[PDB]
Write a protein that binds this ligand. Structure first.
Ligand SMILES: O=C(C[C@@H]1S/C(=N\N=C\c2ccccc2O)N=C1O)Nc1cccc(C(F)(F)F)c1
Ligand SMILES: O=C(C[C@@H]1S/C(=N\N=C\c2ccccc2O)N=C1O)Nc1cccc(C(F)(F)F)c1
Lengths: 251, 251
């Protein structure tokens, strides 16, 4: 079985070769392809990329912050709001609004075959801009044979910085939900609309491309946890993570 | 360049071999895989499948009906509400609610680089069921180099009946929007969550698999059209459609 990270490497390669020039909101140069998908197994492994060191601690901490429902930006001082944007996962507050995350968990428990196990995230800058603002990301969950799978659709994906961080974030989220629903993690599927590489990330990425992936690490949850709000950073241990060196993509 | 329909055939094959048994809402047997994607070129061709005759007339007529915003079910007598569900494309009436379709068209015109060119469809049975009900489908548009591309994400896809019909529907929609925005059709990308085959469709599909695709036909728009509401069925001509025989999938 080939290494899942090869998908990510192949997508970078594909964008470098066939990507077309396209400006973003601020007009600052990307190579762009529309429509991509990769599948990462979560079965006795965890897709924390190995061709560069991924900031796992920030992944964990930021996900925990989102599961809390916190809007205090400084409440996230664990030592530009993207790329996960989980601000409306819990409320739209101790009972005000729909709780998307809790609804996902309950549906998985009350009707695992449901095709509507879906949670959305919005870029907060979009909210005052218009009514019925489009989500930045939709997350769909899926259960078969006691395995929980997750598919993330992002309307756009920064391949150098955001994507590897998002792969780890939603994989971690899936591990958490599986844990509290008594299921085993299955697949994480990552699907993009506008998949793009910033011009200034090109050379660093060309170097990363020449690196050989190493076996993905494992994620262990060290305690028995009951409710999604109960997880702490200390309950998690990444083991066997042997990545190539950090790459600084200069945003 | 291999025939795009081969993607569809390969996905059927993949579901037959690796699909797992999963019940739907009514509990009536499918083989299921989670997460799929196919890309169909719209450049001087139109992805109306050839390994069985696709009911083009119903495709066109139903899309036109949705663009109208009609809720009179009998208003669609052009001779179970799925699989497109375009009921909220225009209103949520001559000015009441967000007009998703018109907003897509305007954004394409006022800011073609926008990553938020998105329109959603809901299964109407979901609406009274809960607040913030998940869409059945999200449709994202994308513009580069005067080409309009479209990606449809469906939370679930009936591979035998719904999928081929949806491929033609969203391809047609893309042709229409391109026409009125002065762009050329690019790619239609079809992405599924729960991609599935009903048990009773298996044998018919196994037979369809042994059929060789023929070149896709072309779609011609016969008149110069200005606003999306102005299209009529008569403005469209499918040419060079030489499909294998009709296959009845017995729902
Ligand atoms: O600096 C960031 C940016 C993070 S990091 C990120 N994406 N990371 C990608 C990434 C990280 C490590 C290795 C490879 C990667 O691609 N997205 C974010 O929102 N977050 C942050 C972390 C700690 C503290 C602070 C604060 F609060 F601003 F000081 C911010
Ligand atoms: O019977 C249908 C079902 C259509 S057809 C469809 N999907 N078609 C798939 C398909 C069609 C032709 C060939 C191959 C296919 O896979 N989905 C639908 O909603 N629609 C219809 C058409 C005309 C008239 C009526 C009415 F109003 F009920 F009488 C309904």
């Amino acid at each position: 079985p080939p290494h899942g990270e090869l998908q990510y490497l192949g997508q970078i390669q594909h964008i470098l070769r066939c990507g077309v020039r396209k400006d973003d909101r601020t007009g600052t140069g990307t190579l762009s392809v529309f429509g991509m998908q990769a599948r990462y197994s979560l079965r006795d492994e965890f897709p924390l990329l190995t061709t560069k060191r991924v900031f796992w601690k920030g992944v964990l901490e930021e996900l925990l912050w989102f599961i809390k429902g916190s809007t205090n930006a400084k409440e996230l001082s664990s030592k530009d709001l993207g790329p996960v944007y989980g601000f409306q996962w819990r409320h739209f507050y101790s009972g005000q609004g729909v709780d998307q995350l809790q609804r996902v968990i309950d549906t998985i428990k009350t009707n695992p075959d449901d095709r509507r196990i879906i949670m959305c995230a919005w870029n907060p800058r979009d909210l005052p801009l218009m009514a019925l603002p489009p989500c930045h990301a939709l997350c769909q969950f899926y259960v078969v044979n006691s395995e929980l799978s997750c598919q993330l659709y992002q309307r756009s994906g920064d391949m150098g910085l955001g994507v590897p961080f998002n792969i780890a974030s939603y994989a971690l989220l899936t591990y958490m939900i599986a844990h509290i629903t008594g299921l085993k993690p299955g697949d994480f599927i990552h699907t993009l609309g506008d998949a793009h590489i910033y011009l200034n990330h090109i050379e660093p990425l060309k170097i990363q491309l020449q690196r050989e992936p190493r076996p993905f690490p494992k994620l262990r949850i060290l305690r028995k946890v009951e409710k999604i709000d109960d997880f702490k950073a200390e309950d998690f241990q990444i083991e066997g993570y042997n990545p190539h060196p950090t790459i600084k993509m200069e945003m």
